[PDB]
Amino acid sequence: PLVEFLGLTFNLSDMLMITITCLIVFIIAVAATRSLQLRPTGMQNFMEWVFDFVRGIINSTMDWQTGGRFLTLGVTLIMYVFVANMLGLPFSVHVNGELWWKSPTADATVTLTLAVMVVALTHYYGFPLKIIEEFANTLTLGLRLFGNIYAGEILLGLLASLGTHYGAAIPMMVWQAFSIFVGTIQAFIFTMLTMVYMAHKVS
Template sequence: MDHESPMLYDLWGIPWLDFNLATVLMTFITCVIVFFICFFASRRLQMKPKGFQNFMEWIIDFVKGIIGDTMDWKTGKVFLPLGLTLIVFLFISNILGVITMVTFGHTLWWKSPTSDATLTLSLSTMVILLTHYYGIKVKGFKEYTKDYVRPVPFLLPFKIIEEFTNTLTLGLRLFGNIFAGEILLSLITKMAMIAIPAFAFSIIPMLAWQGFSLFIGAIQAFIFTMLTMVYMSHKVSSDH
């Protein structure tokens, strides 16, 4: 897929401050979609949920399960909004490129925001910073810093490196899977546009890959949210 998207370079005269306008646009669209999904799901709450409310409550229970598998609920309940926001935002972001490509075809503007490493690494950095914030908030600064020299002070450099690698792996895993999926889908689409016989040949793998891309989008949203809660558990739980 051609990801040479429209860029805004040297914003405000700062040489390194560049913006991918396509990523900014698609991130904004994703946020709007997530807002309306949550708005319509919670607009008319009922004691006996049905329809869209029932679907959203299933997602909430699913996120509760993720948190419950990584830490006790008394400690982890405060992270429910974070987990719910991440899994919904990432799922919409991951599949948006597939939907827009089918609808609008191959363009420079329509793509998944998470096919941009800048966005995924920004999300992973935000997650790691949040784990430090809540770790200090729950344990206190002095007790929290002691975790870096336990059980032996020799581990301090390795634990610092671990924070860096966690940031990279969390962001690059998401980026790599979504970017690679869009590359292959774009190649299949271009194959279909060469000639009518090629279209007949490629329509089946195109549909199959679109379905697989939806599956990958859901799995990657789950993995990112799960790892976020695992990293958070390591910081806030006293048994780590």
Template sequence: MHESPIINVGFDIDLSVVIMLIVTCAIVFILAKMSIRNLSVENPSKLQNFMEWVVDFVQGLITSTMDYKKGRPFLSLGITLIMFIFVGNMLGLPFGLVFDYTNAASATFFGHPLTPVVEGLANGSHGVEIAWWKSPTADAAAAMGLALIVFVLVHYLGIVRNPKHYFAHYFKPFFFFFPINVIEQLSKLLTHGMRLFGNIFAGEVLIAVLLKMSAVWYGAIASVIGLVVWQGFSIFVGTIQAFVFTILAMVYISQSLETDEDH
């Protein structure tokens, strides 16, 4: 696997993740902006039709998890999550951007040395390959960051909008279940983020392995066939993971807002 372009500014920053998050945000913003240009009822554009389909799809996710009157304020959140994660999942599939650094002096970013290059060359490596382009969701910190946003929102809604049921559920069905219920909440955070990270990261690892196979003549044909098959499967996996992450977010929100009357 290739190294990440990490710099230290008192703490480590993975530049590839920062860059790819910005690229993902830009693509989602441009898609959203273009879809509402020249809105038409009689002759809607293909992008407008696509965005309307996304809105209807997310509305369906919300109504499947809670009463739509409660869930309507989270429609924008759901649309943003599913589009952001889908686009992020897809970015690492079509191509990669890898540079081989053999000189530590050239491996800098605005005066900050790339830590993996400096350490690798100091340990005797002839060159260090740095990957600048990848899916942001293939990074554990990015995936867990998305999960943490949902986690904080869910518990904020429970405490502010539904405090009686929120605090009571920690002691159900019995008082001594409190530690187990706390662990359950923490496990939701972990599985929510790591499921997304694990699936996308594994896909990019296999793509890297298949590309390595193409370096030798007898692996070229197999790697090309494997890449075509795996790229198609990765699109499917990336789409499913965007759906799973979003619907779980809606499920967790519905659980924080539910009352005894909802049962």
């Protein structure tokens, strides 16, 4: 399970998982936003429910006039992190090489650069103790999502090997239901703490 990199500069498998999660998020977004309907049904009501959910979170943290801009960053951020956490659970394939296609959030560099991208955005829209608190909250957000996905990934993998090598269906079943629970809770706390620091720096 080594870091398989075709190029010396960057991990190849992480780029593959970023591309596949971007395409699956984009196609579920355009499948939920096919046509305009004033009476919501099907999946457009689901997309509007996620949209008003993100909006509600923004309304909890800040005034609606200040935080109205962030709604379309926040909904793609929660859906992106949501699908990025749930991709690691079904397949997690092992090839004759090092490793291929685990999940993007299990990579520490992916989650830490997504967290520092979040904080770069909330510095863009917006004394040593304040800046060390800033670097502290960046790295604890990135390490939060990275750890709480990567431990479950390793455990699921361990369970998979224990089952295949030699009766053990329900422990990994209970853990895998708990892991999609961890995925949706981590996506929600990630976008909510994103909006908290956005509200803290805007107003």
